[PDB]
Amino acid sequence: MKKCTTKEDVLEAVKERDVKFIRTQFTDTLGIIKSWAIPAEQLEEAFENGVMFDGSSIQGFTRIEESDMKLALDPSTFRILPWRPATGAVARILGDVYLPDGNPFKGDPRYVLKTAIKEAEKMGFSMNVGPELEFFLFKLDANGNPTTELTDQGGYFDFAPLDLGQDVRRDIDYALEHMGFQIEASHHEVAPSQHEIDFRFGDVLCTADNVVTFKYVVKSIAYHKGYYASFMPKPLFGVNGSGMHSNQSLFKDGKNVFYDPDTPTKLSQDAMYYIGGLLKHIREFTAVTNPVVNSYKRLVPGYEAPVYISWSAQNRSSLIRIPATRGNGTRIELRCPDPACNPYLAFALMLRAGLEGIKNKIDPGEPTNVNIFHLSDKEREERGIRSLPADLKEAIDEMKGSKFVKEALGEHVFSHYLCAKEMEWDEYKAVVHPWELSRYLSML
Amino acid sequence: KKCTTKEDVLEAVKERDVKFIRTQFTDTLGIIKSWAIPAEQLEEAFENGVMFDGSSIQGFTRIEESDMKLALDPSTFRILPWRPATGAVARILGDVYLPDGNPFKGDPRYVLKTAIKEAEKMGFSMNVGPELEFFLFKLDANGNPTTELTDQGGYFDFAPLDLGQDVRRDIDYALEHMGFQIEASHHEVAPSQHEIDFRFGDVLCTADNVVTFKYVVKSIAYHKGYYASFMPKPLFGVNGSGMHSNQSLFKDGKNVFYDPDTPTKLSQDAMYYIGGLLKHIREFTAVTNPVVNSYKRLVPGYEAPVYISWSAQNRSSLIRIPATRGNGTRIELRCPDPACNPYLAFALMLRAGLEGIKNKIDPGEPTNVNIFHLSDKEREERGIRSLPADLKEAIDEMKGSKFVKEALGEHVFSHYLCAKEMEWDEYKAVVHPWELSRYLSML
Amino acid sequence: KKCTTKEDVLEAVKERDVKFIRTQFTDTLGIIKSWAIPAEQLEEAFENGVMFDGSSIQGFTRIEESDMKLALDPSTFRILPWRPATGAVARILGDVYLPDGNPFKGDPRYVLKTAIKEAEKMGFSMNVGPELEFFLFKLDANGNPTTELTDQGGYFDFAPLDLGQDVRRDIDYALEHMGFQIEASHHEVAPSQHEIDFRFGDVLCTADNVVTFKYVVKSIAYHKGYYASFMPKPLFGVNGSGMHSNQSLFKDGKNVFYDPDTPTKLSQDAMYYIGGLLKHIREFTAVTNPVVNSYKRLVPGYEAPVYISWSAQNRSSLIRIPATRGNGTRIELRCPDPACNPYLAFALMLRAGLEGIKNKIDPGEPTNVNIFHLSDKEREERGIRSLPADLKEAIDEMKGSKFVKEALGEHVFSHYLCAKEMEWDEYKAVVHPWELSRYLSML
Amino acid sequence: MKKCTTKEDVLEAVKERDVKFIRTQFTDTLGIIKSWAIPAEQLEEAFENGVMFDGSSIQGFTRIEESDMKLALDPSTFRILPWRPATGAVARILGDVYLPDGNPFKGDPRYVLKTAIKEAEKMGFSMNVGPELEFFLFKLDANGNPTTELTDQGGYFDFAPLDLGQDVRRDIDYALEHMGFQIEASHHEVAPSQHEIDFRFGDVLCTADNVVTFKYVVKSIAYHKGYYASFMPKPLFGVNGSGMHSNQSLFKDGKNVFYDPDTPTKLSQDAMYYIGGLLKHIREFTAVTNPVVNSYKRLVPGYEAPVYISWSAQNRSSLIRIPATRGNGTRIELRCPDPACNPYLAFALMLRAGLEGIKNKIDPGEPTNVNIFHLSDKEREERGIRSLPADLKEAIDEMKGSKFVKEALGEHVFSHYLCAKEMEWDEYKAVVHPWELSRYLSML
Ligand SMILES: [Mg+2]
Ligand SMILES: [Mg+2]
Ligand SMILES: [Mg+2]
Ligand SMILES: [Mg+2]
Ligand SMILES: [Mg+2]
Ligand SMILES: [Mg+2]
Ligand SMILES: [Mg+2]
Ligand SMILES: [Mg+2]
């Protein structure tokens, strides 16, 4: 590995490491990973004048017309991919999207996260994020297509699988380390064939880039060993779903502003306000953290995924959890998102909501130290404990009337995101599922 | 002939060689319930009633038993339209009584009777002619139901013309054997979809016939190798099956919906009846459209009503006024599907219209445009609301409805809602193959 | 077996034990439509008419209902040629009326009646004998239609001689048993192809029989394990199926087309009648050849005509004069296929021929040369035009035709064109396997 | 039909109805239905001298040696079977088993019920019984063997099935009525393809004979229409099991001794004592009412089968239930037995236990009007609510040390029953089931 800073740094590394193709990396509004290939010979001119490309690719499947846009490559994002083709090495690079008139394109989710970072800098804060990505490892069918066929029957923290799946699982870990991911931990998860990789706790912009890189790197490596890596929230009924727990904290003057040695919980007042802002707005952008119809098959009671809006320091099954670590490691964990979400939009909205809590001094209320799943509607109503949206349609409706989400995302991203999700829901709600035939065909 | 007394039924049992009597009733959710009585016990049954487990009326939300007595109604005795090897079979209905002697208020038939009583207090009787649409599918190798088609015909097509032509004819002839007096039978819009229109008659008699219709058609089709489906929407991309409910009020021989002196020839009370129906239809859509599959039919683009409006010209309105006037003046509510309990559905329709007449509920200007063609902005300008989009929303609308609670009684109200909530919670957690097709390769 | 009054029908229903009556009508596109009436309700139907959804006539382009009334014509009563165990079945036709009492102008049968009415203004009555060609195919294991051959015979061959010999005989017997008075039946050119020639009768009665013929032959074949197909061109490389229409005009009981002293013994009005047919045929080919598959039959090299011409010698001309003279003098239009709506096709043929007599339209000199053997420039000099080469071209020629719009009425005209356009817009986007076989490896 | 009283009655009916073969009917110790065929020509000599047969057939599968025994035919039990072979009519007949020395064989379960009836007559009581027999209707495989393939998917009191299964279901009802069973009701039961037939409330000895006749008549008729009738307690997991609810009451001087118009529940003191005796001894003979290993897959919480020892008048889910009917129809319903039990032994022990309650004035305690399934072990322990045996081994152990069951059954039946059930359990407990492979093969 190495750290590149100038374009001259990257151009040198291309020659000495025989990099033949550079892959751009970005995401559309919905989080789908987008890319195109540039020959390494073209790279020097790309750094000088940028690269024209069809920016309607960022709109998602709701793109109406073409839109010429410029990608200004960022040399510090240049990273060599962990596979070695016989032809030559391959690397990825990120960048900033500009309109023909020279202004940055506000529709790029990466730009949205960057303006959220700028709002934090105005109040003197920088945000660090450590995500915990759960995924499934399935077998491919005889034609190479993904299935939900299990690769092991192990459980939480099991040393599984121990067949050829042990090697692909180890190959995934090795390649992430080969790219400088600095993985914290990787283990088996609760559901069969389910796995977790814990990212290094680091800067939000760099971490968000790594989440996108993580997805296609794991998928490509699993693919080449005969397996499929799934980031579906809930691919299998009756077992755990896959979430993306998002640990986060704010820093100012190189000090963790969530830690206070004097207070009882050893948490500062800013952390309380940050939690309050998260609890105040979480319903309005659940459609961003849980973006697909399948997301709400995971957001059901009984499988470790939080469906009630609360915070606590003791039990994990709360929406917001405080890990025991204090001092510089003080953080709060938001446990609702799933790996289908766009990391740029999800991290940006978490930051904006938390910052909104700090600037308006939003009290988070008492923590709920009991397991809310053991309570009645009356007991929940007595304590005023609200639910997350029960399906994508409800989350869409809560996001449609949120002035907060519109300001944080911008009009272009806001309408394009909602329009795409509405078409997704309208298509889903009309489908006659086999479950309905099994229950009703004989009966009616 | 017509049966009126227990002596009429008993001699008909001797004369037609009836060996088995099947009782007929429904639970809260509309599932048809029955048990078999040997014909020789029929005399004792008329004299003392029949003890049975009334917990069968609860539906699948039953936990404890409850001894109940069925008092047979001799006028409901009817011989079933199939002739077994040894003796004919007949069905009979009755009134369910608690051991203390009071009528059981949880019986859906009793619920319709109280609604009839409410209309009688006002001097009205309700006539109902329902239009029942069903699908005719073939059976698989093991005799199990499928959704595999029997024809590719369309609206009013003379189809099927293969062996399916015979089973369709057999169904029509069986209903006529029972004295149904069908008005029409024809092919519907979707492939393998058929419709049978009932005679316009008294609501209590009609509701009894809808229940009888369902298992009679299913049994006749089964014994010919076919399956009759009353699912609201068994197939994607084609029409669903509804149960349009033409209804009318009569004040001792006169149709109160007719008025020769108004321009539309509809009376004021017909306008109020529509107003009450429109005011409350959201509150009991869970009764007219009771299963999860019901709301795959209530989607835009298939002539099933989605928006709440009335008209005399556009058919795709929630409430349609047919052209016929005079004695045949009626209004047609087009949202219900054949999965609904006809006793509860007709009772709530009657109460809502009666409430409109009592409270002079203006129905507003008719929507003479296709609301489907309009945009969401115009709908708000015209104040056009929608029917519930799924069973959960319909459950929530009914949950806080004083009108529905009073009309059904608190027994049926809670039992019906509890069953539907359990049904929804099971459905909502299922991971469907559609999700795998869309997201397994994408995420 | 001649029915004239409603009392004639009612007595025959009672004597022959008819239990179901089937109405018979067609929609705008020629699909046969029907609904069933129990015979007990037949007497009320004769007195008051039968209310039904008139949008069924509109085709598949319907969105809104329209309540209409069918006034039954007792002279069209006819018992169907199959005998259910329950009882006999009969068909009946009638006229469609709006609720206001006016005849519905959108019924194709009404469109034919107006052409008959305009012909009577000049003292003309039209007789037609249609020659209907169809295919007899096998059913697959599931009873679905296929194009599997039932014989390999040719023109006028005594084939098939296996069990297919019995179904062909059963078809002929069923038609004779129903009073059709078939003239001849024989094997057609293509394998498994068959032709049945109708008696020369009045246009209205003949048109009703063409509709009845189609579902009778269909049902009889189905119940023997075979499929009767009326597709124009179900099989590439062999003859298509046409519906040749021999027609003649009568005035004062004598044949208008016959003239004993003329060289060809053809009258001046016969020449004018052909001229009107030739002048307008391009404008309503979309009616005589209504489906996309119709123009796979209208390709050069087979019996189907693709060039607008007439002759008394060549077969392959669009219009041919049979050698028969006197009372049997007739002209034969050979372009239609059995998919056409007979009411609309016969009406437009009559109107076009009538416009020829009204306007003294000269038909030109006959083309006695096989036009297929000619170059494009040869036909250019002789003014020989061709039929539209696909459905879209036929639609465009009909779209801008004052003659067709007036003869059908603005409602039938609009609805027919809108449905056919939707048809073509679906077909034009399909990627066919032939394209895959030709271009996948090449490009 | 007709009622036969003398041997001359039966012999006449044989000639006029062309009965060609007579089938004896009895049961072994475990309830398996036993029979052998007698030609009708032999019948007259059979009434005169009896029929020698191998009485070790009554011992069950624990028969060690042969034992010559005599069957004295009972003419009043002669009944013509409801099928009509082309060869000739067929009838069944019961009788009494005698040893070569002329004494009745005490090992016949029918004798055991008869001595229980004699104990009731000593105290002036006669017992009436109405059983409710649940059974399943399954499809046969391609070779004609029983399966658990469903014939319908209907539920409680559904009008199902409506295909050819509607005819076999109706054929079963018709044939029972053709034999003079006088069926009270027949309906669909809770589980798919499950059905119930309610017997006429009548004399215990006659009713017990009918239960045995019912089983092979239903099975034979279902068999000849292509179906299988199953009396397994729990053939399918996750749905209801099949029970044999046993309604009963005592009569003296033609009056129902369970009815008292003066008491609050309108139940006499004898009924209270009768319930007390049943509750006192039910554990000791659960092995008789629930005799097979499969019986205790039904005796699990949650599927209408009672697992706790209690009585009540309101909720059915009690072990003993009082129906609402009073006066001459006053009865108590015992809901634990399943149709696998021997009716002679089960009815005899219920009678003996109830009579023991009356003679010792055993108070039944307060009724438990709450659903016991909603209670903790502590709440159940506080009210002293005991459980039924949890498996056949536990029931065997409770029966092995019961002086009451030994006296009521006799030594021969007692040891032979227990020895057979112990061998049944020893064979079962050693089997390695597929469930164990599914759970442990991958894990260990
Ligand atoms: Mg985890
Ligand atoms: Mg965590
Ligand atoms: Mg309809
Ligand atoms: Mg209608
Ligand atoms: Mg020909
Ligand atoms: Mg010809
Ligand atoms: Mg039961
Ligand atoms: Mg019971």
Curated annotation (Swiss-Prot), chains A, D:
NCBIfam families: GlnA
Primary location group: cytoplasm
Regulation: Directly stimulated by the effector molecule 2-oxoglutarate. Inhibited by GlnK1. 2-oxoglutarate antagonizes the inhibitory effects of GlnK1, but does not prevent GlnK1/GlnA1 complex formation.
Protein name per its UniProtKB record: Glutamine synthetase
Enzyme Commission no: 6.3.1.2
Chain ranges of the GS catalytic domain: 109-444
UniProt keyword terms in alphabetical order: ATP-binding, Cytoplasm, Ligase, Magnesium, Metal-binding, Nucleotide-binding
Cellular component, GO annotation: cytoplasm
Function: Probably involved in nitrogen metabolism via ammonium assimilation. Catalyzes the ATP-dependent biosynthesis of glutamine from glutamate and ammonia.
Subunit structure: Homohexamer. Interacts and forms stable complexes with the regulatory protein GlnK1.
Native source organism of the sequence: Methanosarcina mazei (strain ATCC BAA-159 / DSM 3647 / Goe1 / Go1 / JCM 11833 / OCM 88)
Positions of Mg(2+) 1 binding: 132, 245, 333
Residues where Mg(2+) 2 binds: 134, 189, 196
Compartment(s) where it occurs, according to its Swiss-Prot or TrEMBL record: Cytoplasm
Swiss-Prot record, chains B, C:
Pfam families the UniProt entry points to: Gln-synt_C (PF00120), Gln-synt_N (PF03951)
Cell compartments where the protein resides: Cytoplasm
Domain (GS beta-grasp): residue spans on this chain: 16-101
UniProt: Mg(2+) 1 binding residues: 131, 244, 332
GO terms for MF: ATP binding; glutamine synthetase activity; metal ion binding
Protein family: Belongs to the glutamine synthetase family.
Protein name: Glutamine synthetase
Species in which this protein is naturally found: Methanosarcina mazei (strain ATCC BAA-159 / DSM 3647 / Goe1 / Go1 / JCM 11833 / OCM 88) (Methanosarcina frisia)
